[PDB]
Paper text:
The yeast eisosome, composed of the BAR-domain proteins Pil1 and Lsp1 (hereafter, Pil1/Lsp1), scaffolds a membrane compartment that senses and responds to mechanical stress by flattening and releasing sequestered factors. MCC–eisosomes are relatively stable, and have been implicated in sensing and responding to plasma membrane stress: various stimuli, including hypo-osmotic shock, heat shock and mechanical pressure, cause eisosomes to flatten and release sequestered proteins to affect signalling or transport functions. Here we isolated near-native eisosomes as helical tubules made up of a lattice of Pil1/Lsp1 bound to plasma membrane lipids, and solved their structures by helical reconstruction.
Our final reconstructions were made with three lipid mixtures: (1) ‘minus PI(4,5)P2/plus sterol’ (‘−PI(4,5)P2/+sterol’), containing 30% cholesterol; (2) ‘plus PI(4,5)P2/minus sterol’ (‘+PI(4,5)P2/−sterol’), containing 10% PI(4,5)P2; and (3) ‘plus PI(4,5)P2/plus sterol’ (‘+PI(4,5)P2/+sterol’), containing 10% PI(4,5)P2 and 15% cholesterol. For all three lipid mixtures, the overall architecture of the Pil1 lattice is similar to the native-source samples. In the +PI(4,5)P2/−sterol samples, the AH density is improved, and the AH density resolution is best and most resembles that of the native-source eisosomes in the +PI(4,5)P2/+sterol samples, which suggests that PI(4,5)P2 is crucial for AH stabilization. One feature that was notably absent from the +PI(4,5)P2/−sterol helices was the pattern of membrane voids in the cytoplasmic leaflet that we observe in the native-source eisosome filaments. Notably, these conserved residues were previously shown to be important for eisosome assembly in vivo and membrane binding in vitro. This extra density, not present in the −PI(4,5)P2/+sterol Pil1 filaments, is likely to reflect a PI(4,5)P2-binding site in the native-source eisosomes. In addition, in the CG MD simulations for both the +PI(4,5)P2/−sterol and the +PI(4,5)P2/+sterol systems, PI(4,5)P2 occupancy was increased at charged residues in the lipid-binding pocket, especially residues R43, Q60, R126, K130 and R133.
Residue numbers in the entry:
A (entry chain B), B (entry chain A), C (entry chain L): 1 to 271
Write the structure that this text describes.
Amino acid sequence: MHRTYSLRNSRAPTASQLQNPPPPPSTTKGRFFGKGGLAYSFRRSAAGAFGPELSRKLSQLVKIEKNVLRSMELTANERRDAAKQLSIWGLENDDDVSDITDKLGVLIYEVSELDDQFIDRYDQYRLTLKSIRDIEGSVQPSRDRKDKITDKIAYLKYKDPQSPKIEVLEQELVRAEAESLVAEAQLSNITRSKLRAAFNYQFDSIIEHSEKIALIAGYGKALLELLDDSPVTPGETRPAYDGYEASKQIIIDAESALNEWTLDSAQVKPT
Amino acid sequence: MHRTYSLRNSRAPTASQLQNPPPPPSTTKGRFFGKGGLAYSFRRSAAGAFGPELSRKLSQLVKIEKNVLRSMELTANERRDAAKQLSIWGLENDDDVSDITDKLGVLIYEVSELDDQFIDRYDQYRLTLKSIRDIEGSVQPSRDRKDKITDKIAYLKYKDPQSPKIEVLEQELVRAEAESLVAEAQLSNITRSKLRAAFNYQFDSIIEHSEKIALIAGYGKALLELLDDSPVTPGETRPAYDGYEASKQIIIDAESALNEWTLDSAQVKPT
Amino acid sequence: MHRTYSLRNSRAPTASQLQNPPPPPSTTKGRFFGKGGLAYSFRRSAAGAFGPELSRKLSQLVKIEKNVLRSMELTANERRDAAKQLSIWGLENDDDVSDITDKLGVLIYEVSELDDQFIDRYDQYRLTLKSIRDIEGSVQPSRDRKDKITDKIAYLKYKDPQSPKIEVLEQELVRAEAESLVAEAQLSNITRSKLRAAFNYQFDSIIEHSEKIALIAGYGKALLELLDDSPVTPGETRPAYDGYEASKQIIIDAESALNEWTLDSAQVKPT
Ligand SMILES: O=P(O)(O)O[C@@H]1[C@H](O)[C@H](O)[C@@H](OP(=O)(O)O)[C@H](OP(=O)(O)O)[C@H]1O
Ligand SMILES: O=P(O)(O)O[C@@H]1[C@H](O)[C@H](O)[C@@H](OP(=O)(O)O)[C@H](OP(=O)(O)O)[C@H]1O
Ligand SMILES: O=P(O)(O)O[C@@H]1[C@H](O)[C@H](O)[C@@H](OP(=O)(O)O)[C@H](OP(=O)(O)O)[C@H]1O
């Protein structure tokens, strides 16, 4: 980010900013959360009311991840809805405009399925991250008791060293210590392995979806060129338009290329 | 989509589905709109209450586009918020886990700025699409009057052909016809040109953002490999971890590569 | 269909639409089901009230197929009835008009027999499709019991593993499993074979009937040319008409050609 060498949140100029000026900001910027309900805050605050202390930190993230998933679902649904209106608007216009509108409308409506698949994979990653919390919360109580029965024996030794409970308390401490050692080792093992596996799974899906979206956008941009936007003075008639044999071929080729693409066919080559 | 050769919304198997089984669906699917308020429906329904008939179809799309923008903003904000919790969770863990968590946390927090830039460019595209509606709504009333003063002269000719208003009404019809012809030609010219320009502008931003996101995801996946997830039995100590000189270099290289990338350096090559 | 590349149900222009403008829509379009009775819905809803779950899906289609057959029968009956009125109307007119009306009336009345034969063949295809449902509904109960006596043994093993019923329950499971395996294999075999045979039988009849109808229509169109429609001013007498020797020959030739046609004499050659 730009904060890593500046005291202000303003963004330093980049290659894109040098080539083209930064886009103007939004006309309206309301100073509101935009959630529209108390459900988000209630769910965020109710997680730690009764849960164990050790697993609270990770358990808090699951709720906000679910909120992210819901917001992405709403975004995808609304973007899918917009394509229908864009398509129907083209009925009362020229034939070329109507045809281009319909084809680009299905092309842009394609996005919703990719968004839904990405949402499902995000849900699986969230499920694994949730699965970590179960082992953490199971580990905590075994550690608590061993610590408590240590203060117990310390206090009882302070009160009087002639009590016969010293040896049994010490042996209970030894057994609890062995169990806690085993639990503590496996906890680190499991958290490392699960974090690595889940996070690799989550990182593959996003790049796959991004590459598919980029391919769809490129195909749409290639298709848009066929409009033949030329100025005409009043009193003239533009020639009849015939581009169905090109538009249909473009749509079929785009669908086939999107379907054929596989994981090993990734065009992006990071440096 | 899969609807183009099937009667059911189910998706036909693809290369990705053949390689890996489809992800399991979400655990909960509530049968609700999810908007959380009547504002969306109210804004959608109030657009056509008083506006001209010709521009209503295009004016209806602006509101849903604004809703899409707001939902995307909420998604970006929540995803940005999640990274902070992910980062703070790593404090109470092993040193390697904490370091990897912090670095990948900033790497995944990077996404919000790209989302905001895409939102701004989307807003500019929406502004141009709005600008089309002004010319449409200005064109409509000029066309309405010429049609009305035609039924007027027709009715007055039917009533009695000896009235002296025939010639003045006919000439007013001629003048209104000339003005309507000019307006009708320019309307088509302007709508074609503006649609092409705005839609090219909108299609470039999405592919740029997708390529940047894919690069960030690839760099993060490359960074994640350094975890060295190996199983350890209880009673052993893992060697001290030293990977700061690699993690910091990876972060710096990723930031430099993201900054250096330009429009002409697009790796994606559509067929 | 036209939905396979468009978001709207509107039909894209075709060769026929390019050659001739699309026909105007019907004058009246009532927003009603048109069934005229609750019998259709009652029969559709009563099929699954008590039947087995596996065969319900296929059993639901038989009722709607019977409804299709009844509607086709009503259509054929009404079309047959219309020819009688068309023929009787020609009595009070010119001799040539009366003769042409009678001959084309029998030619168009011919259609009803072909429709009845197609209906009978449709009924046979429906009978075979019904015959599939019997085997499906016989297969289901054999599968249900094997599954149930599995949950039974699982629960009884959970309750106490020292019961002596484990071995007898397990052997009953084994025998039911073998029977279910045999039934499951034969079910797939039978459904595939019956579907293929019935659907070939159903597809042959429709093309035969369509070819016969096309031949009849072509012969009628050829016969209609003999009317000699020419304009006449008042005060003149048209020459006496003599075309019985041509009309009777045309009717006889049409009947002979329709009778002689066989399956191997199909003129249609799909690409
Ligand atoms: O049906 P409700 O009223 O919505 O409540 C759900 C229920 O408490 C589940 O046990 C819980 O799963 P977990 O115990 O695994 O957390 C889920 O949270 P989740 O969807 O975030 O998993 C809750 O939404
Ligand atoms: O300030 P408010 O109460 O929110 O009302 C705004 C105001 O009516 C603007 O004129 C209008 O811009 P337009 O006339 O150009 O539509 C805008 O719509 P918009 O944001 O969709 O442009 C509205 O949100
Ligand atoms: O005589 P009704 O009162 O009309 O009732 C008939 C009777 O129940 C038949 O057994 C049944 O054949 P199936 O058992 O084979 O279904 C037929 O359905 P069908 O004509 O669709 O075969 C029914 O119409």
